[PDB]
Amino acid sequence: PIVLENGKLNINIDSKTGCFSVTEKTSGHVWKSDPWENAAGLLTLTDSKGKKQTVNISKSKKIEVSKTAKNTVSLKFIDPVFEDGSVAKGVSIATELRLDPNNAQLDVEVTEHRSGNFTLYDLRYPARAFSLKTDEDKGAAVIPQKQGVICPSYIFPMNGGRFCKWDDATYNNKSQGSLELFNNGTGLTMPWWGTYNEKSAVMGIVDVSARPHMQYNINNNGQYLFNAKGVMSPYQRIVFLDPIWKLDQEKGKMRISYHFIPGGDYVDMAKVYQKEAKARGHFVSLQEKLKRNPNVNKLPGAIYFGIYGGYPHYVNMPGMAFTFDELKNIIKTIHDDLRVDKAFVHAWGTFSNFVPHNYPISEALGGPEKLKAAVDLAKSYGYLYSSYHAYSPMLENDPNFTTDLMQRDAEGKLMNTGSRWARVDPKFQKGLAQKNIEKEISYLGLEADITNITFAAYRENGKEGRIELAKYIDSFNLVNGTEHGQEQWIPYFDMFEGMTYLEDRPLSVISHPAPLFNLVYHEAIANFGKIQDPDNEVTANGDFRIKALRSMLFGRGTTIFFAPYEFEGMRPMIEMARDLVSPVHKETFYSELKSHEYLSADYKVQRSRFSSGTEVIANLGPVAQKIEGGISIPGYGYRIQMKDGSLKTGHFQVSLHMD
Amino acid sequence: PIVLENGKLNINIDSKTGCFSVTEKTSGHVWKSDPWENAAGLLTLTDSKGKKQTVNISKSKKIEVSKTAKNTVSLKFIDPVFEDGSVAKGVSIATELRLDPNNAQLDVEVTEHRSGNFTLYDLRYPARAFSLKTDEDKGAAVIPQKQGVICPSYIFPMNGGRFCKWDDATYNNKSQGSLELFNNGTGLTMPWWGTYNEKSAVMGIVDVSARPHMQYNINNNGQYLFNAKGVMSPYQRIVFLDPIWKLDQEKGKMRISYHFIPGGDYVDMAKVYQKEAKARGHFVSLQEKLKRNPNVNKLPGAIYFGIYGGYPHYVNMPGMAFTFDELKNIIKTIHDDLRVDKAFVHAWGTFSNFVPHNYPISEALGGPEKLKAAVDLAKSYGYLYSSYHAYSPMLENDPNFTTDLMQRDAEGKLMNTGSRWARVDPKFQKGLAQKNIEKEISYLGLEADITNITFAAYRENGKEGRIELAKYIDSFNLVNGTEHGQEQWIPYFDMFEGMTYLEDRPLSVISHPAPLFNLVYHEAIANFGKIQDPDNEVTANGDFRIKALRSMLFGRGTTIFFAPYEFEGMRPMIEMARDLVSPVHKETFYSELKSHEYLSADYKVQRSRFSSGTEVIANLGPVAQKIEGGISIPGYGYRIQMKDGSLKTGHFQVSLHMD
Ligand SMILES: O=S(=O)(O)O[C@@H]1[C@H](O[C@H]2O[C@@H]3CO[C@H]([C@H]2O)[C@H]3O[C@@H]2O[C@H](CO)[C@H](O)[C@H](O[C@H]3O[C@@H]4CO[C@@H]([C@H]4O)[C@H]3O)[C@H]2O)[C@@H](O)[C@H](O)O[C@@H]1CO
Ligand SMILES: O=S(=O)(O)O[C@@H]1[C@H](O[C@H]2O[C@@H]3CO[C@H]([C@H]2O)[C@H]3O[C@@H]2O[C@H](CO)[C@H](O)[C@H](O[C@H]3O[C@@H]4CO[C@@H]([C@H]4O)[C@H]3O)[C@H]2O)[C@@H](O)[C@H](O)O[C@@H]1CO
Ligand SMILES: [Cl-]
Ligand SMILES: [Cl-]
Ligand code: NA
Ligand code: NA
C-alpha cells in the first residue's frame, strides 16, 4: 500500500488496483473502497463489435500507481479488459489523488483519457466510494436535489404506507440512477454531495468548470446489475454517490474536492460549500441588495399572490382571464378584508399578444388606464406588483409564431421543438425585453418585476444571452424575482419563485426534504413556493398544513396561486398564512439558517434555527411526539421561539361541519 | 369506396388505403380515420439491415379490399414500404371488418400476418381512429386505468397550478405513451376504452383471449414524431386511443368490438361493458356472496384498519412491531372510545417467520393465546379480523431464502429477481398456504381472511397456480379479501384493498378520476383504499377531505393504515369517517352505481346516484360552486340524499389553533 499522510487523514492506496481507503483520524472512521467488485473506476465504452459495455478499470492490463510528491499519487489504467476477455488496446485513463498538507481535503481528478479505435462515454471515478453500510452505519446520503434531500442509510419507524414504499424502493430500480446538475427538473442545484454516519462526514465539491452527473444508490444491493443475467445479487446493501464524468462531452477539469468533517452532517456540508459559493461569486447578500434598493424590504412577510388568468397559455381565456377591474378588486380585498400587510401581486394575463411579445396592455381587459389603477392601488398598500413576462417561449397557438427566433443545431435541426416555453435563442432575449419593459416601468410606475422561464436552469448553451438579459433587468434597480432560479443567477435577482420540490421526482419515497439550498443561500436569495405546487393545492408535497409548517422550517415565503374563480376558497389559507407564516417569514428574512435537525425517529419533527434569534419546531406528521425535555409537539403542530421572546404554539385542525 | 351499412351505422372503407370512417346516423357524427398520415395501420418491424422500423401499412405495394360476406370486408396489406423505399418483401397483414346486421357494433380483427425473413413486432390497427379534435369536440377519452380516468378533449377552467401542468402536458411527451392490461401498476383493469363528444360515444372491447397494449394521445399534435428530425409538427392536436397488437407475443384472437352509443359518455360505456362482464363470468354479485356467507354483512359501514407492524418487511422490527396485548388494546379503543360500529381489523405482524412461511404465531409478540384473546375481542364486537398473509414473496433478508421456489424463463434465467414480493412461482403457492392456513383458521376461530400480492394482477403466466390458490382460499367460506384485485378475481373474493389510483402515474396531470371500474362492478366487489395511499396520508391523490368525499362518490370504503405509534393521530380521521363515510357506505354497499356526473366546468363538483336510492353530491375543490337550481355546494363540502329522503349537508374546514 501507498500512504498519503497529514495530521487529519490517512489515504491508503492499493498499488495493484488503485483503490483507496481514507482514514479520518479524529474519529477513527475508515471510508472503504468499492465493497462490491474492488473497482477503482467504472468505464463505459464500445467494444470491438461496437456494442457498449462497462468495465472495471482495476482489471486493466497495466496499472501504474506511484507517489510523486509527499502528497500526490498518479494512477494510470492501461488497456482495460472486457467481460469476455477481449482487450481494449489503446485505451487508457490517468488520474491523480492530491492530499492537502494542512486540511482534511483530498482532490481527485481524471487528468487524461485515450480512446484508441474505441469510444469512451461515462467514467465513474471514484467508483462506489465513501459508502455507508445499510443498517450498520446510522446516517444518510446528502443530495442537493432542488432544495435538498437526505437519504437515511438504515430502516426506521414511519407511517405504514410510507414504510412499505420506502423499503420496497431500496430493493428495486427506484433506488439507483443518475441526476444532472443545474436544471429545473429532477437535478441538483449545487455541485456537491456527501455521506455521513455517526462518526464523520465526507462531501465532494465538483470543480466549477465541470459538469459530471451524479450516480446514486440508496440502500440497494446492486440487483439491477444482475437482473438481465437472471441471477441474485451477491452484494451487500450500501449507500453511495458517485461522480459520472462524461468523457464524450467534458471540456472542463474533471476534479472533485473531498472534505472530511468529524462529527459532521448535512449542516456542516452546506456550510463548507457556503465558503465555496462565496469564492465563486454566487453569494450576493440580501442586505447588500437592500442597500442598493430599499424596496427589497417590501418582501419580508409578503405572501406571494399569483393571479392566473389562463395566460401565457392563452390570450383572454374564457372562465380564466381577469379584467383589470377584477384585479383591482382582488387586491383591495386582500388588503381591506383579509388585512394582509405585505404582498407580491403577480398578475398572469395583462397583455393582448402572446409571449415573447409582452405588449400591449390588453384593451379587452380594460386597457392601460385600468391596469394603472390596479397597480396604483397596490402601490398605495405598499405591495409589490408585476405582470407576467417571458422572453423565451415560442408557442404553436400564437399567430405571430416564427422559427426565426429559435436556435438550430449544426445539422439545421430546430432545437427545443419539444419544449415550447424555452424556444427563443437566448441571444435574442434582451432585445425582446427591450421592446416594452421600459415603457411598462415608466407608465405603471413599477417598483418590481418578475421574469419567468429563462433563469430556471444554468446550461452552457445560451448562457451569454441569458447573462445579457439578467444584466439588463438588474440595471433597472427594481425588486426583481425569477422562476426557480439557480445559484449562478443569485447576484441578479432578489427572489426565486420555487427552489423547493417537484411532486414526482426520483427518490421521493426514500428521502426526506432537507433545506440544503437555504442552508447555503438563505441570506442571499429569498425563495417562495412554486406556482405549479402552491400552498393552496394538495399534492405529493403536502397540503396547506404540511406546506405552511415546512415554509417556516426551511425559510421560504407563502405562495397562493389561483384562478380568479377560486378566490373565495383561498381566504382561509390566506388568513392562516397571514397569521402564522408571515410573521416568522418577516423575522427570519435576512438571516442565516444556522442549523436544521430532525428530532424524531421518523424525521417528521424538525427544528430550524435562524441568526435572527428565531427557532422553529414543527411536526409534519399526524401524531403528537415528544422531544428533549418532555416537551410535546402536536401533530401538524409548531413551537416557535420568536426574537421578541414570545413562544407561538399550536397546530392545524381539520374539523367536519355536519349541518 | 366499399360500404357496410345497417340501420344505425355507415362504414366507409377506402379501397386504396384501407382506412375507414364510421357515420353514426342517429347523431350524424362521423368518426374519422387517421387524420395525420391517413394510415389504416402502423406496423413496427425490422428492416433488411436489422433496424426497427414503423411503417404506414396503407403505403404497401398491394392492398386488396373486398366484401366477402354481406356484412364482412376482408383487407390485405402486402409488402410494406420502408421510409427509404426498400420493400419488406413477403410481409402481409390480413384484417376483417364485420358489421353487426342489427346493432351499432363493428368488429375489427387482425386475421393473419406473415413475416417472411423480417420480424414483426407491433401493430396499431386501427391506427389513430375514432379521434376527437382538441378544443372542437367537447368530450373525453375514457381509460380504465385502475379505477379509471377521463381525459377531456379541450381546455377548461381549473386551478392555475393544475392548468399550467395540464396544458403543458398536452405539448410534451406526458400525453403520449402506452398502457398494458391487468397489472397493479399503471395499467388498465378492464379490456376496453373509448372516446365521446357531445353527439356520440364509441368504445372498443378487446377479445377475451387477446392482450394488446393501448396507445394514448391526449390532445397531442404529434410533435413527439418530429423532435428527432428537429421540425415543427404539421398535424392537428387530437385525442385517440389505439390497440397495440403485439404480433411477436400474441397467441389469442386479435379482435376488438366497437360499440357506438348516440348521446353516450363513460357511464354508458361502462354499462355496455357490464353486460360483457357478466357474459364472461367475472360478475358475481355481493348479494349472491351474502347468501353463501352472511358474515359478508359485517362489511357495509366497516372501516378497514391496517395495523402495520413492520411485517412482512421485517420480523419483530423495533419501534414498529406491536405486541398482541397492544393489538387487543387498539381494537378495544376503536370500539369503546371511537365508537366504530363495524371494522375489518388487519394485523401486519403476527408470525415469527418471514412470508411465504406464515407461521408460527410469534412467541415474541405474546404467543397464540394472546393473539387469540385479541381476535376473540374483535369477534365479540362483530369485527372482521385477518393476519397478514402472503404466499408469493421470497425475501433476501429471510434466512429461508431459496431460488428453488422461483420461476425461470425460456433461457433458464430467474424471473422477478427485481420484484421480491412476487418471486415464488404461483404453482407452489397453494402448497405454501396449506402449511398453516387451516390451523390458524381452526385455532383462532376465524371468519375472514385477506391474502396479499398474488391477486393484484392477472397475467397469463402462472394463472393456473393463482386460480388453484384462489379456489383453495375460497373453499373455506370466509369473508375474504385480497390486495388490489382484478376483474378475473371478483368471483373468489368479497373485497379488494385498492382498485383506486397510483400516486405517480402516466396521465395524472391531464385526467380526472372517474369511477369506471365501480360503475361496472360495484354490485359485485367491495373496495377500500390502498394501504400505501390510505385516507390518513396526504398524497398526490389528496388529503382526508378529498379522499373521504371521493370515497362516497365512488362507492368505496375507508382505509386507515398506520404504524402503532401513529394511533393517537388517527383518532380525528377515524371519527370523521365514522360520522360521514360509514353511514353512506353502509347504505350503498350492495347497490349499483347507476350514474356519475361532473357538474362543474372544472370537474370538481360531482354527483353519484346509487340504486339504493342514495344521491351523493360533493365538491373536491376549495371554492363553493353552484349547480342546477342555484344549489350551492361548499368547498370540500357535500350534499347527500339518503334512501329515506333525509338530506345531509356539510363540509370540512381546516383552521389554525394558536395558543
Ligand atoms: O415531463 S416529465 O414527465 O414531468 O419528466 C420530468 C422532467 O421534465 C420536466 O423538467 C421540468 C420540471 O417541469 C417540466 C418538465 O418538463 C420541466 O419544467 C418546465 O420547464 C420549462 C422551461 O423549459 C418552464 O420553466 C416550465 O415552467 C414555466 O413555463 C410555463 C409557463 O408558465 C409556467 C409554465 O406553465 C412556468 O412555470 C417548467 O414547468 C424530465 O426531464 C425528467 O426526465 O423527469 C421528470 C419527472 O418529474
Ligand atoms: O417502480 S416504479 O417507479 O413505481 O414504476 C412503476 C411500475 O412499478 C410499480 O408496479 C407496481 C405498483 O407499485 C409497484 C412498483 O414496482 C408495483 O406494485 C407492487 O407489486 C407487488 C406485486 O408484484 C406487490 O403487490 C406490491 O405490494 C405488496 O408488496 C409489499 C408488501 O406489502 C405490500 C408491499 O409493501 C403489499 O402492498 C406492490 O406495491 C413499473 O413496473 C412500471 O413499468 O412503471 C411504473 C411507473 O409509475
Ligand atoms: Cl419548501
Ligand atoms: Cl377512490
Ligand atoms: Na434588483
Ligand atoms: Na368469499
Side-chain angles (χ1 to χ4, degrees), chain B residues 107-125:
Chain B
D107 274 2
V108 180
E109 179 170 4
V110 183
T111 60
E112 217 186 279
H113 60 79
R114 293 196 269 204
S115 293
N117 298 314
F118 305 82
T119 310
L120 300 183
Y121 285 105
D122 289 353
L123 183 67
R124 318 227 307 254
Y125 185 82

Side-chain angles (χ1 to χ4, degrees), chain B residues 147 500-501 550 554 556:
Chain B
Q147 173 66 224
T500 50
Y501 296 93
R550 191 192 293 121
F554 286 19
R556 75 151 169 103

Side-chain angles (χ1 to χ4, degrees), chain B residues 30 107 192 197 226 265 268 354 377 411 546 551 555 608:
Chain B
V30 176
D107 274 2
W192 63 269
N197 60 25
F226 296 97
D265 61 18
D268 307 279
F354 288 99
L377 180 62
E411 310 162 294
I546 294 165
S551 291
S608 287

Side-chain angles (χ1 to χ4, degrees), chain A residues 39 96 158 218 307 406 468-469 519 554-555 581 603 656:
Chain A
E96 303 175 358
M158 71 195 99
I218 306 301
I307 297 155
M406 300 178 61
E468 289 177 11
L469 177 60
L519 282 166
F554 286 29
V581 176
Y603 295 74
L656 176 56

Side-chain angles (χ1 to χ4, degrees), chain B residues 38-302:
Chain B
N38 203 42
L42 298 163
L43 179 57
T44 296
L45 77 164
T46 70
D47 57 23
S48 49
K49 7 127 190 179
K51 173 77 235 102
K52 234 200 293 177
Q53 284 291 333
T54 294
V55 305
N56 178 340
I57 63 175
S58 303
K59 307 234 239 151
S60 294
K61 277 335 243 205
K62 323 184 184 72
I63 293 174
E64 301 169 353
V65 194
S66 48
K67 214 176 246 158
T68 53
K70 173 163 183 300
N71 289 315
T72 299
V73 170
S74 292
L75 297 87
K76 204 173 160 154
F77 310 82
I78 309 163
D79 282 356
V81 183
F82 289 107
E83 233 177 65
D84 63 55
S86 60
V87 186
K89 204 127 148 54
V91 170
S92 51
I93 309 292
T95 64
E96 261 174 30
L97 307 178
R98 298 184 300 264
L99 176 60
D100 186 290
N102 299 280
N103 307 318
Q105 159 167 352
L106 171 74
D107 274 2
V108 180
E109 179 170 4
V110 183
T111 60
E112 217 186 279
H113 60 79
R114 293 196 269 204
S115 293
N117 298 314
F118 305 82
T119 310
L120 300 183
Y121 285 105
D122 289 353
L123 183 67
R124 318 227 307 254
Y125 185 82
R128 309 195 275 257
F130 311 112
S131 57
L132 306 164
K133 267 76 236 158
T134 301
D135 286 323
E136 290 173 48
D137 292 301
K138 300 307 175 69
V142 179
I143 307 161
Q145 183 190 46
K146 214 170 298 302
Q147 173 66 224
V149 302
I150 61 157
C151 301
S153 63
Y154 66 103
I155 195 58
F156 57 92
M158 62 186 109
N159 162 268
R162 303 292 178 177
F163 192 109
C164 292
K165 293 181 284 180
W166 191 291
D167 199 72
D168 294 2
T170 67
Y171 282 99
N172 62 32
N173 282 296
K174 278 153 89 161
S175 46
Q176 62 94 356
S178 72
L179 303 179
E180 129 175 308
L181 295 184
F182 302 134
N183 63 46
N184 67 337
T186 69
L188 272 60
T189 49
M190 297 182 289
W192 63 269
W193 53 78
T195 40
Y196 69 97
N197 60 25
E198 315 97 304
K199 282 188 203 313
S200 59
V202 54
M203 72 187 289
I205 301 188
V206 178
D207 192 277
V208 72
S209 72
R211 268 173 183 270
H213 293 346
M214 192 210 71
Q215 182 78 13
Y216 51 89
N217 181 100
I218 308 305
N219 308 296
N220 197 305
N221 69 1
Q223 185 56 60
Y224 54 96
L225 303 171
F226 296 97
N227 286 339
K229 289 171 181 270
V231 313
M232 299 302 305
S233 173
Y235 303 153
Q236 181 172 15
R237 287 154 60 74
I238 57 173
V239 183
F240 67 77
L241 315 165
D242 300 349
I244 309 174
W245 309 104
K246 316 292 284 183
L247 299 181
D248 56 336
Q249 300 149 228
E250 184 65 67
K251 297 270 210 211
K253 177 198 259 293
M254 290 176 299
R255 176 179 67 116
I256 186 166
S257 303
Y258 290 104
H259 299 259
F260 295 80
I261 309 160
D265 61 18
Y266 57 98
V267 173
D268 307 279
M269 301 184 184
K271 298 312 172 178
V272 170
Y273 181 65
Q274 194 189 82
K275 300 181 186 113
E276 174 70 30
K278 286 151 155 163
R280 293 185 188 197
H282 305 324
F283 190 111
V284 177
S285 85
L286 288 155
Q287 274 175 353
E288 282 321 289
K289 294 167 175 181
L290 170 62
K291 297 205 304 92
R292 181 167 172 254
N293 186 349
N295 281 334
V296 164
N297 207 49
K298 296 182 177 197
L299 287 169

Side-chain angles (χ1 to χ4, degrees), chain A residues 218 248 282 437 515 642 648:
Chain A
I218 306 301
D248 60 323
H282 308 316
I437 196 56
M642 303 291 287
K648 289 159 143 228

Side-chain angles (χ1 to χ4, degrees), chain A residues 159 162 165 167-168 227 313-314 414 417 421 503 537-538 565-566 602 638 649 651 653 655 657 659, chain B residues 159 162 165 167-168 227 230 314 414 417 421 503 537-538 565-566 602 649-651 653 655 657 659:
Chain A
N159 163 263
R162 307 292 187 179
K165 286 180 282 178
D167 205 63
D168 290 358
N227 286 338
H313 297 71
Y314 298 92
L414 287 170
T417 51
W421 298 106
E503 297 159 54
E537 281 297 305
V538 176
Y565 81 87
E566 291 185 291
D602 61 11
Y638 57 90
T649 55
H651 66 278
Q653 190 68 52
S655 65
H657 291 259
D659 326 339
Chain B
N159 162 268
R162 303 292 178 177
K165 293 181 284 180
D167 199 72
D168 294 2
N227 286 339
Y314 302 92
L414 294 166
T417 54
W421 299 105
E503 291 171 62
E537 279 293 306
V538 180
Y565 82 85
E566 298 187 288
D602 69 0
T649 54
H651 65 280
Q653 147 191 95
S655 55
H657 165 57
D659 283 310

